[PDB]
Write an enzyme that holds these catalytic residues in place. Structure first.
Site, PDB file in Angstrom:
ATOM      1  N   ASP A 106     -13.668  -0.067   9.810  1.00 18.96           N
ATOM      2  CA  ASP A 106     -14.196  -0.017   8.437  1.00 18.96           C
ATOM      3  C   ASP A 106     -14.371  -1.408   7.808  1.00 18.96           C
ATOM      4  OD1 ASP A 106     -15.313   1.187   6.154  1.00 18.96           O
ATOM      5  OD2 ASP A 106     -13.340   1.592   5.239  1.00 18.96           O
ATOM      6  N   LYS A 118       0.861  -1.173   0.000  1.00 14.61           N
ATOM      7  CA  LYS A 118       0.000   0.000   0.000  1.00 14.61           C
ATOM      8  C   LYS A 118       0.903   1.230   0.000  1.00 14.61           C
ATOM      9  CE  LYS A 118      -3.969   2.030   2.427  1.00 14.61           C
ATOM     10  NZ  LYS A 118      -4.748   1.975   3.699  1.00 14.61           N
ATOM     11  N   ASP A 155     -11.161 -11.340  -2.597  1.00 13.52           N
ATOM     12  CA  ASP A 155     -11.881 -10.708  -1.497  1.00 13.52           C
ATOM     13  C   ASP A 155     -13.317 -11.230  -1.486  1.00 13.52           C
ATOM     14  OD1 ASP A 155     -13.620  -8.717  -2.982  1.00 13.52           O
ATOM     15  OD2 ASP A 155     -11.693  -7.856  -3.506  1.00 13.52           O
TER      16      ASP A 155
END
Ligand SMILES: COc1ccc(F)cc1-c1ccnc2[nH]c(C3=CCN([C@H]4CC[C@H](CC(=O)O)CC4)CC3)cc12
Length: 281
Positions: free
Chosen positions: A117, A33, A76
């Site tokens: 989140d 990331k 995912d």
């Protein structure tokens, strides 16, 4: 950073871009990331190691940029649900994934760490039947996502700044309902539409079911008063054990909401197993 070679872009967020990358001096395939108090709060995440949490391998601070190196997973839950939309994820697999995520949350929550989140796209799955929590909580190209507020707990939407671990239980309850029904539970496209979608289904909260709700910063006495719809309409054809657990995960009062630890003891998991999903990679 010279120790990594980019292979492709796998995601994006408000403050970062995520790539699939290869570690030159180890051969490892990772997710990278790219983005003082943050450096310490993220170094604590390096110690939060659990089989149902995506491993944070390293934190690299180089020339005004911060790189997070994670263990790579191929799929995912959002993509798996989109791929199982016409058939539905089998109940034993939904139950296994819910149980594994409650184990990951029981762990995080015991170490005073909140995710904040949870959403299907930050739940990663492997070929072994595992599911893991990723991306514990500006790029101009980041595209707004329809699902962004769908999993937000009502206390967050009502402006509570000192919210608890119960916000993660709410988000996981929304995900559980979505796996079962193959449709998002509260598909809100703004903070008020998200709040009103919750109210339409669970009833407008009041002091009876949520003591102190009328004193929340963004609470307004002018909110329309919707009656709670009967719960058998919300997640058919989920059985009574599943509906009971889901209702406890969706209690308005964060103090009445089931903890991850208590949820693991719920009768719904008496017959929990670990099935293998069929993944097309
Ligand atoms: C949420 O995870 C993160 C968030 C922040 C972060 F910093 C790292 C991770 C992260 C950590 C470890 N492993 C990971 N793997 C992945 C993905 C693998 C393939 N996903 C697919 C591509 C293809 C699509 C369909 C299409 O575009 O055709 C369907 C989805 C995307 C996400 C992300 C990711």
């Amino acid at each position: 950073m010279e120790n990594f070679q980019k292979v492709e872009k796998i995601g994006e967020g408000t403050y970062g871009v995520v790539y699939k990358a290869r570690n030159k001096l180890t051969g490892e395939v990772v997710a990278l990331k790219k983005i003082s108090t943050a450096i310490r709060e993220i170094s604590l995440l390096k110690e939060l190691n659990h089989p149902n949490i995506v491993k944070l391998l390293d934190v690299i601070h180089t020339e005004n940029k911060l790189y997070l190196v994670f263990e790579f997973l191929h799929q995912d839950l959002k993509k798996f649900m989109d791929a199982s939309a016409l058939t539905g994820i089998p109940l034993p697999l939904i139950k296994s994934y819910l149980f594994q995520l409650l184990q990951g949350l029981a762990f995080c929550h015991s170490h005073r760490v909140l995710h904040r989140d949870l959403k299907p796209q930050n739940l990663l799955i492997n070929t072994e039947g595992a599911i893991k929590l990723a991306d514990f909580g500006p790029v101009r190209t980041y595209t707004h996502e329809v699902v962004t507020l769908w999993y937000r707990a009502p206390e967050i939407l009502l402006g509570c700044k000192y919210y608890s671990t119960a916000v993660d239980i709410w988000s996981l309850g929304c995900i559980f309902a979505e796996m079962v029904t193959r449709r998002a539970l509260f598909p809100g496209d703004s903070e008020i539409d998200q709040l009103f979608r919750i109210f339409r289904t669970l009833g407008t909260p009041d002091e009876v079911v949520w003591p102190g709700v009328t004193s929340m910063p963004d609470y307004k006495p002018s909110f329309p008063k919707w009656a709670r719809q009967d719960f058998s309409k919300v997640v058919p054809p989920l059985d009574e054990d599943g509906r009971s657990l889901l209702s406890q995960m969706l209690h308005y009062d964060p103090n009445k909401r089931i903890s991850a630890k208590a949820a693991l003891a719920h009768p719904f998991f008496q017959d929990v197993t670990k099935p293998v999903p069929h993944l097309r990679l």
